[PDB]
Design brief:
This is part of a larger assembly, with one copy of chain A (44 residues) and two copies of chain B. Chain A is an all-alpha fold. Helices cover 80% and strands 0% of the residues of chain A. The two termini of chain A are 23 Å apart. Classes of the chains: A mainly alpha (44), B alpha+beta (44).
Chain lengths: 44, 44, 82
């Protein structure tokens, strides 16, 4: 059961990450990492 | 005057930057949760 | 005495939402200081408890700031007494 729970939670988190990815190349990815750390969504 | 030390989890665990005057409090807060972390609600 | 609270460089950005911590960007504290009484009147010989609460952000920091408290004679109260 735990593996399926992880898969579902990861899918949701990844959809959120894809929305943030649409928001704002490798520079884009670095900026997204920096913005996640700044906003604290990465902590959650 | 208010002075405080916002420290990362790694730095707290290793006691990297806690002053010696407060190391006991730092170790307490690390081993047994002594500081609140308001969770609020996750975006996703 | 009227008691008002001010933060020199410690002011919160116009506690903080966990998701929207980016507001702390460009702020010297990288935290939100608050005090439970922002501005309260106080009778003579009355002791007031003020809770100072700090909600820190993602950036590790060491702060040594100063918070000001302004005390003035309560003209409204004394006029009411008169």
């Amino acid at each position: 059961t735990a593996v399926d729970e992880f898969k579902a939670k990861v899918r949701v988190i990844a959809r959120a990450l894809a929305e943030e990815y649409k928001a704002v190349a490798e520079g884009r990815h670095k900026a997204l990492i920096f913005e996640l750390n700044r906003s604290g969504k990465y902590a959650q | 005057t208010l002075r405080g030390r916002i420290l990362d989890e790694r730095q707290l665990g290793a006691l990297r930057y806690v002053p010696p005057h407060e190391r006991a409090a730092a170790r307490a807060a690390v081993v047994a949760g002594a500081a609140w972390v308001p969770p609020a609600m996750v975006p996703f | 005495l009227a008691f008002d609270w001010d933060l020199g460089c410690l002011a919160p950005p116009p506690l903080l939402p966990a998701s929207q911590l980016q507001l702390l960007a460009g702020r010297p504290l990288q935290g939100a200081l608050a005090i439970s009484p922002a501005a309260g009147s106080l009778e003579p010989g009355e002791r007031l408890v003020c809770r100072v609460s700090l909600h820190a952000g993602v950036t590790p920091q060491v702060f040594e700031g100063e918070v000001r408290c302004h005390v003035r004679i309560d003209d409204d109260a004394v006029a009411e007494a008169e």
